[PDB]
């Protein structure tokens, strides 16, 4: 029998950046703008927290804004705009329309099956599978470049796409090399008798 | 004045995989009966399973004449498996051609850097990494020169992966280290 794509892929969090095109006084911007945190002496970058959604923008003075929190784009872009609308309330001007770069996108995955750590170590290439020091397998995947956390429940940790599609690509790519390999167990299935 | 912040990380290896090739097609059924405790199902694994106590080792034989020997944490120790194993084969029958070379397919290393570290701001100052605590408590960085993936604890623990020489690992790790303090992320114990 043949063993069904039942992978879920879910988003734990986007890392983006926005440029600003223009040079800020972080000092000026932290005495302007209420409850922000600026210590240079600490960090680099202003801390703006936005809370429900829980996002967190870091301001630097190369008018470089990391944005980190939200699980998808349309969160990405709504915390974005109500960033940029307090800056604005505040004090700073924009020239013209900020562009957004995804940075870095995390997800999770479930591909449903239990896989043979052991037996996949020894049949896949680029991989790490050392119990005592990590319990997963971690395979550094090319295309696209993506690092994979692979746990023997069928849990996984991708990391490194820059697109929702990639990350989509990475699951189904490991899900079917593993039934390739024949390296997985569909235990939420009834079996032979 | 702030302090210097000296190199004082210490390297662990804590496994070497390397392939042997033994230059012939090899015939498992026949190599399972002919060596005593080994094991092969190719209905559940393609390659003979043979593995040696002390220290424990572990070789995996296909039929290209590949053999997998994993287990070993030391060059020295590679080298004194791999001999161990042909040694049998042949007690055993196999007949060997010339002399097999190796190859590091991978080495596993840990690493105590000494140091505290700050992940929540070496992962907003670093590049190529993640860093999300509830889906795996360290940070992992993926490093191109050299090519290997490290996976850093607060604590100063460290994961390295990916690399083929052990000078590969040391640099990677001086590397990540000097990199952290030039951007502040880290403390003294």
Redesign the interface.
Known sequence: DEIPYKAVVNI??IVATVTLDQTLDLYAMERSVPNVEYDPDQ???LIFRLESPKITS?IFKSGKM?V?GAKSTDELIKAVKRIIKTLKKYGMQLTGKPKIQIQ?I?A?ANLHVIVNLD?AA??LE???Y?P???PGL?Y?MDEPRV?L?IFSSGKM?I??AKREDEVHKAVKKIFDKLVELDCVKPVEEEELE
């Open positions: 734990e969090n960090f680099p970058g870091l990391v980190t870095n995390v999770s037996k020894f049949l680029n991989n790490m050392e005592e020091q990590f971690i550094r690092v956390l940790v990391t490194g």
